[PDB]
Design a protein around this nucleic acid. Structure first.
Lengths: 716, 735, 96, 249
RNA sequence: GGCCUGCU
RNA sequence: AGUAGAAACAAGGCC
């Protein structure tokens, strides 16, 4: 039958009908009479629509061939011959522009004169039944319907026929051409009734070929095919198989509970080796401040001018000389770098306006100090294979180092009060609710407690230094840059003040990965002689740069004044995390506020004021040789703030591992102290897990010592 | 006196101050170089936990595979992957018996979803291993490349737009003699059957960064695109199953987890009378993923899909069949340094099979020596067990089956147990009349776990009396206690854009106040610090200050120009009006009545060249990877302002041989923008159909010109011009 | 490196007092030279010539880098040009 | 006119012609998401790192013809170098602030009508009345509650057709909404937003947010009302309760 | 010496 | 040298 559509109809219509065939997903080889019927429907749609044009009037202009002009409007514009999505697109667009009603089924054409749709259907059966059939299929329709049938008859409601009658003679001539051409073909044994509305399909997902063999190799050891295994599974029913293997399984497979008593836990062993060194990016306990007493705010001002003005406030400069060498570098380079920094600072002082940011010369001194041109050149393996020295990067456990007493004192003095306010908080919306007033009062109390704390000063120092370093690295990637360490505080009298700890020289910072390292050299003034705790300054070079006179009742001290100079490095991640050190304030004060709220849930009243003023209640916050010492809530605030600050400063994988594996043991010990009969399956394994995190970090070793002290004081 | 914060625990219980034990204020550990060492170590460890299995050689991939299932029962407490098929089938049968109709229903909804799912659902995924280029690429890019290759090779069933048809094409590709791929350096290369099989069965290995809570780094894996559809269907089934199990806690959030934990502890302890003792085990499973054999997941799913259409069973079984034969790419490689000659070199991992061992240290030398037998075409066969939690939900199903297997109806003894399982972590409440009963119950639970290939970490687990325990960093002490140290890293600028960062910060403060019991004063301090960091990050200072920045001049002139300066946004250098009462209001709407009409109009102008919206999914959704958890998405309330710009892209593609991808990106985006202008609903609802672009665009041009004349700007001259231009593009597409 | 500016010289009666100062912008001091005589040390900062002990007092402010010389009980023999040193000033006349 | 003209210009060049011809409508989404840009793992680090560069943001090409290349002192506002995989050009953040002080102005009166949810929140809070804070232990129990206070009793899909018919009336397709509540919602949001020119996508997104019901599990103590849950952070705490009555009541 | 890139 | 820690940075590539 398909030979007929090969022969007669034009290409355009046959591929339109083929795409309509693909539309609903049925195959053309099984039933083709539908293809012919609907392609004839589509053909009558065209032949009825084309050759029919309109101009600004009604009364369509009919031309056998559209002449070249703007007057190519089509009388009837076709609906079908398009995908369902576009057919409904045209339906909705016509409804929204023509203000007509939206039909629920697919029309075939639209006309302007009568501003409505045409649903053309030419069926094998006579018209006077198919018409009202499709009419009762369509609900309350104003779209006019018109149908032909092979006998040659026409019909329509309203007795309406919308265009010329010679066109309809055309239609029925086409119709009988179709008819008495099948006459030569002979199809009416099924042509009248060949489609009955079949819609059914079964989804087929068949495993075959290579993928089947893979299925045959992904079974238990004693199975040969997926078919057999699935049959076995379907036939499988529970018949007490877990019990049999449990009985047969060796009894050494057990989870015996070892009781956890007061005498069970042993102190954590600390590693032994050379004392632990300093790792901070700046001096914490041995910092010195040169000040100007200016009225500018933290960010307000220009760095270089402030630094120069602060440094001019000090008199007593001496020619620098080596006091304590780096022990691994070239100290003369550090000396020359310091003198170069001074010289270029003067050079800025001379000229017209202090630059906002200064670049330094790339001398051999800072070329060595900043580690320039030291990365091995990257080459290909095929060119370097016979080199005996060629091997992997050194990948082994870090060097072992024992704890020293300097970190303990540094933390002790990091929780001490100061003679300045190191936090100038921002603005918030004016409090409107009583709860907001309570929150503001609490916040004011904590700010009064923690602002005068060395932890806040360290927070500001780190934030400013890391912000400046990151910005300089991102801006001046190539050229070495000078950045004075600046921090602005407020005195007890209320006068604002600036403080200059020293200088940082940032080097080449072409940082691609988050782990890539930018090297800088840090110089900081101090008065602490490095000849008393040399092991804490393994990586520092310390010079003697001047003498300071601070008013004291013992005449006047006239102390020496040294310069701690070192080469340090950071990374994008480290800079970003060090510039978010202000969340240590959060951590600490959230803990304290949780304490206050928990206690106030007992007594139905806010308990902040008496906690902060009466200072009757105290918490164990340290141990003295006499015994455990307790301090007021403010001291707890400062201690927790210092702990968070040191966590942010000495952060490392060792800290995370020890924190987790020691929190586990802390929970076990707490369960013991709560009389909850705690038990363990392998306590030695937990101890070994904790002890492997303690390698060389001073902070984690101090935490381990604190944990041992807590165990000793606990378990009683 | 020496200060010691830990001594604070002598007065404050450990859980009431547990936040102090979370050093989440410093930089988390990161990996620096290759992850090849970790990948090799994981492969060797997975293969040696199942050493007593039986060896075979796949006839298709030619790789050695180790099957430990039904192997000898363990005789020691060391990790073992010798799961027994009959035991696990019985466990699943008991799970079904205790929850009748679970499998049949879940299979019904899964069948509905599979037969109505679309291909585009695969684009909604993070990095995936594209085999066309042998590298990780965004899910959409890899899917597009694979579809292009399939269409070039003759597999065009995916044009039906159905994921099931895409999987049919994927499987049909397995039986092809020779496929063709494209490489740029364009060159057409031919892949034989075995090479393509291994490229479709392989995984890409990387090192996990920003992982807090352990000293050593780990390795993670990413699968290809051929196997992700089957994984999607299997995980849909597993999620539908677990949603019907109250003992599971994987498909829920954190608060639901806490609620279920409280309910189970109350149920276990309350029902226990005075005579019965109760004990809670806070258990962690050692080597959870390395001991879960994909064959056992195949067994579980084929038991689940019993009495179901065979096509459903086949499509759900394809995934574990491929995992059982999965291969893993070793990784980036190894970098060597020579200090004598002062140079460095980078050898790819694919050379580990043949490269001499003189360059490697003792540990790496032994690892390579042990893993070499499993090396096939630069990748190692990893049949014995899963790599990194790809089947999280099925593992949770197995754990829930174990938990339910002790409902006192199967124990047949006075002791019994229950609890909650979330993959790699569990809380087990066991009750028994005497300490001997508790010991026997825990021993039998451990033994049954060892029969299913699941191991309990004795070093990271402990048992106490009920009332105090831990679960996924949630510490329960007669009621869950807030931590607030897990969410600390999320208190900074997110890094999306100005308005997005502001809204996300305020919303995070609000949420942590609601859930994590953040205090009022602490919340105010957090708001102040966040505002300070926000102003210092975006160079948007109050405007009345003299802080010179790269943006302080325009901000200051805008400040001096504005009359009601209280309406200026913090992004434009205005005062901050936020407070505890205003944390749930966008900044634009909070300052709407205070803005001057000129500034208000300039700010919220639709014609601004900065705002760009791509799809309904990416309107106000921000992907923030939370600390100590999987990547998560958040809805943030924000008004589309001129500050909603999107930041610069990487721009490093220009120096790579894969430079033509940018031209293809530009052309695809131009075509997509044209289509959207032709089809405005393209973004909100993704268009569907089987036609091509130009057909729809030209035909809609026809119709829209028509109707927009029937009322609108068009004129006959223009309408006819459009009609004949449509004809022109038609004849152009002809040729 | 340092520049030295003297002030406070002039004309004074026998038994009178006069105050010199030196603004400097190690040791600093005052020297004097009388007509036809060599330049002699007066005081430095302390150390003092025997001729001026109990009569002349030197002090130093390090903050402002200033070295005052208070001269009391002046005599005709103290008539000289007085020079600051740290480097030399220009010299300031003192006539008793 | 224009649209078909850039269509013809695209089809003029062979590569785009092939892309338009061979690519089917269904693959629309795929190729639209086809990109070499990886999703950032650490957005904060790079946002703090990119903002230190010049020209850190991106904007459409049209910015080159509305904003001058430099400001009064000569600080550059935009660059002509396009982004990696787009025709957009990289520009400095000042071009934002500049746009807010001398850029074109419009009538933003209809934004309150569009962003109905946020302005309703503001109005509800502005007329709220606070009360005394009572300090007592709060038994926070976890419950499933609806957060959206303006949901019109419609699901996502249920209101998606309404949203399309309100914004994209022609792409609705087969669906014609039956429920009369949807009829009235369509009428109201059609006549209200008849000429709003913000964007079809944002209008659809905000209509989805407003009409679609959404639910989440939260620890609550009292309240349980939709209006009382949006301020759950302000009314309920660990040991304090703040009586509050939104402006709506 | 000149120019390109900074998660590809 | 320095940062850092089971492998890396201490710029890369292209002419």
């Amino acid at each position: 039958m398909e030979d007929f559509v090969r022969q007669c109809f034009n290409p355009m219509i046959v591929e339109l009908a083929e795409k309509a065939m693909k539309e609903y997903g049925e195959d053309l080889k099984i039933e083709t009479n539908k293809f012919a019927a609907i392609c004839t429907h589509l053909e009558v749609c065209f032949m009825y629509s084309d050759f029919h044009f309109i101009n600004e009037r009604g009364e369509s202009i009919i031309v056998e061939s559209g002449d070249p002009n703007a007057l190519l409007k089509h009388r009837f514009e076709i609906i079908e011959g398009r995908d369902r999505t576009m057919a409904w697109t045209v339906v909705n667009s016509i409804c929204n522009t023509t203000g007509a009603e939206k039909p629920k089924f697919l029309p075939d054409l639209y006309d302007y004169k009568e501003n409505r749709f045409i649903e053309i259907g030419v069926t094998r059966r006579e018209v006077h039944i198919y018409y009202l059939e499709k009419a009762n299929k369509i609900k309350s329709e104003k779209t006019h319907i018109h149908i032909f049938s092979f006998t040659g008859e026409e019909m329509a409601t309203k007795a309406d026929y919308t265009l010329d009658e010679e066109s309809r003679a055309r239609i029925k001539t086409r119709l009988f051409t179709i008819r008495q051409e099948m006459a030569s073909r002979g199809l009416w044994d099924s042509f009248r009734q060949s489609e009955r509305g079949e819609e059914t399909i079964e989804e087929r997902f068949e495993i075959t070929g290579t993928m089947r063999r893979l299925a045959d190799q992904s079974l238990p050891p004693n199975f040969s095919s997926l078919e057999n295994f699935r049959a076995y599974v379907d036939g499988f029913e529970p018949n007490g198989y877990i019990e049999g293997k449990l009985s047969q399984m060796s009894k050494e497979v057990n989870a015996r509970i070892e009781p956890f008593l007061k005498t069970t836990p042993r102190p954590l062993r600390l590693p032994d080796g050379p004392p632990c060194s300093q790792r901070s990016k700046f001096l914490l306990m041995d910092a010195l401040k040169l000040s100007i007493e200016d009225p500018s705010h933290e960010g307000e001002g220009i760095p270089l001018y402030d630094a120069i003005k602060c440094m001019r406030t000090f008199f007593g400069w001496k020619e620098p000389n080596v006091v304590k060498p780096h022990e691994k570098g070239i100290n003369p380079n550090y000396l020359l770098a310091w003198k170069q920094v001074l010289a270029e600072l003067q050079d800025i002082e001379n000229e017209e306006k202090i630059p906002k940011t200064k670049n330094m010369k790339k001398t051999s001194q800072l070329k060595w100090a900043l580690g320039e041109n030291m990365a091995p050149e990257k080459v290909d393996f095929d060119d370097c294979k016979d080199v005996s020295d060629l091997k992997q990067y050194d990948s082994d456990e870090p060097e072992l180092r024992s704890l020293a007493s300097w970190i303990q004192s540094e933390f002790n003095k990091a929780c001490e009060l100061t003679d300045s306010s190191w936090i100038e908080l921002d603005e918030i919306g004016e409090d409107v609710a009583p709860i907001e007033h309570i929150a503001s009062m609490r916040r004011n109390y904590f700010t009064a407690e923690v602002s005068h704390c060395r932890a806040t000063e360290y927070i500001m120092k780190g934030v400013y230094i890391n912000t400046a370093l990151l910005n300089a690295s991102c801006a001046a990637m190539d050229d070495f840059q000078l950045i004075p360490m600046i921090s602005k505080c407020r005195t007890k009298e209320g006068r604002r003040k600036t403080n200059l700890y020293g200088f940082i020289i940032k080097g080449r910072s072409h940082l691609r990965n988050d782990t890539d390292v930018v090297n800088f050299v840090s110089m900081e003034f101090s008065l602490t002689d490095p000849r008393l705790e040399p092991h804490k300054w393994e990586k520092y070079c310390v010079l003697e740069i001047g003498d300071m006179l601070l008013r004291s009742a013992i005449g006047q001290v006239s102390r020496p004044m040294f310069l701690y100079v070192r080469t340090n490095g950071t990374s994008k991640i480290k800079m970003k995390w060090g510039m978010e050190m202000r969340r240590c304030l959060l951590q600490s004060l959230q803990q304290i506020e949780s304490m206050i709220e928990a206690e106030s849930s007992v007594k139905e009243k806010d308990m902040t004021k008496e906690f902060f003023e009466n200072k009757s209640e105290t918490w164990p916050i340290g141990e003295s040789p006499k015994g455990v010492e307790e301090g007021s809530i403010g001291k707890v605030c400062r201690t927790l703030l210092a702990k968070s600050v040191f966590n942010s400063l000495y952060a490392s994988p060792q800290l995370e591992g020890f924190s987790a594996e020691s929190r586990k043991l802390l929970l076990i010990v707490q369960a013991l102290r709560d009389n909850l009969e705690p038990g363990t399956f392998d306590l030695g394994g937990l101890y070994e897990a904790i002890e492997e995190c303690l390698i060389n970090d001073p902070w984690v070793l101090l935490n381990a010592s604190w944990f041992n002290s807590f165990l000793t004081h606990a378990l009683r | 006196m020496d200060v010691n914060p830990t001594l604070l625990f002598l007065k404050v219980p450990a859980q009431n101050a547990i936040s102090t034990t979370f050093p989440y204020t410093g930089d988390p550990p990161y990996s620096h170089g290759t992850g090849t060492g970790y990948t090799m170590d994981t492969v060797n460890r997975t293969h040696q936990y199942s050493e007593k299995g039986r060896w075979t050689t796949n006839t298709e991939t030619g790789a050695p595979q180790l099957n430990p299932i039904d192997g000898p029962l363990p005789e020691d407490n060391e990790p073992s992957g010798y799961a027994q098929t009959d035991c696990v089938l019985e466990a699943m049968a008991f799970l079904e018996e205790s929850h009748p109709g679970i499998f049949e229903n879940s299979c019904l909804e899964t069948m509905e979803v599979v037969q109505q799912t679309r291909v585009d659902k695969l684009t909604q995924g993070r990095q995936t291993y594209d085999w066309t280029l042998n590298r990780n690429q965004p899910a959409a890019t890899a899917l597009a490349n694979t579809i292009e290759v399939f269409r070039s090779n003759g597999l065009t069933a995916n044009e039906s737009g159905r994921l099931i048809d895409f999987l049919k094409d994927v499987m049909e590709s397995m039986d092809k003699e020779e496929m063709e791929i494209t490489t740029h350096f364009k060159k057409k290369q031919r892949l034989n059957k075995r090479s393509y099989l291994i490229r479709a069965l392989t995984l890409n290995t990387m090192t996990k960064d920003a992982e807090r809570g352990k000293l050593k780094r780990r390795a993670i894996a990413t699968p290809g695109m051929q196997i992700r559809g089957f994984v999607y269907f299997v995980e849909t089934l597993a999620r539908s199953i677990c949603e019907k199990l109250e003992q599971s806690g994987l498909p829920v959030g954190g608060n639901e987890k806490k609620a279920k934990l409280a309910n189970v502890v109350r149920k276990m302890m309350t029902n226990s009378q005075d005579t019965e003792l109760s004990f809670t085990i806070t258990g962690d499973n050692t080597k959870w993923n390395e001991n879960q054999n994909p064959r056992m997941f195949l067994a579980m799913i084929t038991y689940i899909t019993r009495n179901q259409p065979e096509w459903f069973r086949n499509v759900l079984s394809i995934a574990p069949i491929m995992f059982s034969n999965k291969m893993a790419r070793l990784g980036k490689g190894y970098m060597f340094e020579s200090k004598s000659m002062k140079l460095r070199t980078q050898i790819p991992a694919e050379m580990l099979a043949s490269i001499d061992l003189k360059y490697f240290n003792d540990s790496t030398r032994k690892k390579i020596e042990k893993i070499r037998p499993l090396l096939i075409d630069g990748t190692a066969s990893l049949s014995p067990g899963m790599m990194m939690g790809m089947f999280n939900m099925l593992s949770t199903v197995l754990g829930v089956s174990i938990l339910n297997l002790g409902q006192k109806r199967y124990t047949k003894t006075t002791y019994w147990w229950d609890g909650l399982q979330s993959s790699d972590d569990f809380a087990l409440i066991v009750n028994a009349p005497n300490h001997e009963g508790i010991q026997a119950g825990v021993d039998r639970f451990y033994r049954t776990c060892k029969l299913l290939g699941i191991n309990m970490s004795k070093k990271k687990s402990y048992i106490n009396r009920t009332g105090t325990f831990e679960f996924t960093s949630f510490f329960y002490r007669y009621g869950f206690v807030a931590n607030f140290s897990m969410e600390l890293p999320s208190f900074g600028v997110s890094g999306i854009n100005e308005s997005a960062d502001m809204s996300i910060g305020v919303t995070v403060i609000k949420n942590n106040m609601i859930n994590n019991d953040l205090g009022p004063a602490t919340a105010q301090m957090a708001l102040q610090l966040f505002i300070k960091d926000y102003r210092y990050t975006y160079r948007c200072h109050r405007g009345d200050t003299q802080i010179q920045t790269r943006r302080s001049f325009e901000i200051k002139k805008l400040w001096e120009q504005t009359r009601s300066k209280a309406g200026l946004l913090v992004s434009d250098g205005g005062p901050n009006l936020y407070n505890i009462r205003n944390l749930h209001i966008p900044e634009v709407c909070l300052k709407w009545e205070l803005m001057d009409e000129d500034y208000q109009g300039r700010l919220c102008n639709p014609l601004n060249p900065f705002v760009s919206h791509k799809e309904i999914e990416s309107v106000n959704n921000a992907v923030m990877m939370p600390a100590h958890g999987p990547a998560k998405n958040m809805e943030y309330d924000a008004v589309a302002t001129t500050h909603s710009w999107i930041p610069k892209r990487n721009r490093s593609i220009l120096n790579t041989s894969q430079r033509g991808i940018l031209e293809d990106e530009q052309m695809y985006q131009k075509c997509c923008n044209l289509f959207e202008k032709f089809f405005p609903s393209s973004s909100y609802r993704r268009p569907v159909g089987i036609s091509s672009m130009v057909e729809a665009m030209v035909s809609r041009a026809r119709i829209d010109a028509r109707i927009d004349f029937e009322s609108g700007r068009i004129k006959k001259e223009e309408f006819a011009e459009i009609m004949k231009i449509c004809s022109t593009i038609e004849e152009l597409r002809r040729q | 490196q340092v520049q030295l500016q003297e002030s406070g010289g002039g004309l004074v009666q026998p038994g009178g007092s006069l105050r010199l100062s030196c603004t400097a912008s190690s040791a600093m001091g005052w020297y004097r030279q009388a007509p036809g005589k060599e330049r002699e040390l007066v005081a430095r900062i302390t150390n003092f010539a025997d001729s001026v002990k109990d009569r002349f007092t030197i002090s130093r402010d390090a903050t402002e880098n200033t070295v005052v010389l208070q001269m009391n009980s002046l005599k005709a023999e103290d008539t000289a040009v007085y020079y600051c040193n740290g480097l030399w000033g220009q010299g300031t006349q003192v006539t008793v | 006119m224009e649209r078909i003209k850039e269509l013809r210009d695209l089809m003029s060049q062979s590569r785009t012609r092939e892309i338009l011809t061979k690519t089917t409508v269904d693959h629309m989404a795929i190729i639209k998401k086809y990109t070499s840009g990886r999703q950032e793992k650490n957005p904060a680090l790079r946002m703090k790192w990119m903002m230190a560069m010049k020209y850190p943001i991106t904007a459409d090409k049209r910015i080159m013809e509305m904003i001058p290349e430099r400001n009064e002192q000569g600080q550059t506002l935009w660059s002509k170098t396009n982004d990696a995989g787009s025709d957009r050009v990289m520009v400095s953040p000042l071009a934002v602030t500049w746009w807010n002080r001398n850029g074109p102005t419009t009538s933003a009166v209809h934004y309150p009508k569009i962003y109905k949810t946020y302005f309703e929140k503001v109005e509800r809070l502005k007329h709220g009345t606070f009360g005394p804070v009572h300090f007592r232990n709060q038994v926070k129990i976890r419950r499933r509650v609806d957060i959206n206070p303006g949901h019109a009793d419609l699901s996502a899909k249920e209101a998606q057709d309404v949203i399309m018919e309100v914004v994209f009336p022609n792409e609705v397709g087969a669906r014609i909404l039956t429920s009369e509540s949807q009829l009235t919602i369509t009428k109201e949001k059609k006549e209200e937003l008849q000429d709003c020119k913000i964007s079809p996508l944002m209008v659809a997104y905000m209509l989805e947010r407003e009409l679609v019901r959404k639910t989440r599990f939260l620890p609550v103590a009292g309240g349980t009302s939709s209006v009382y849950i949006e301020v759950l952070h302000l009314t309920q705490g660990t040991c304090w309760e703040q009586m509050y009555t939104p402006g709506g009541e």
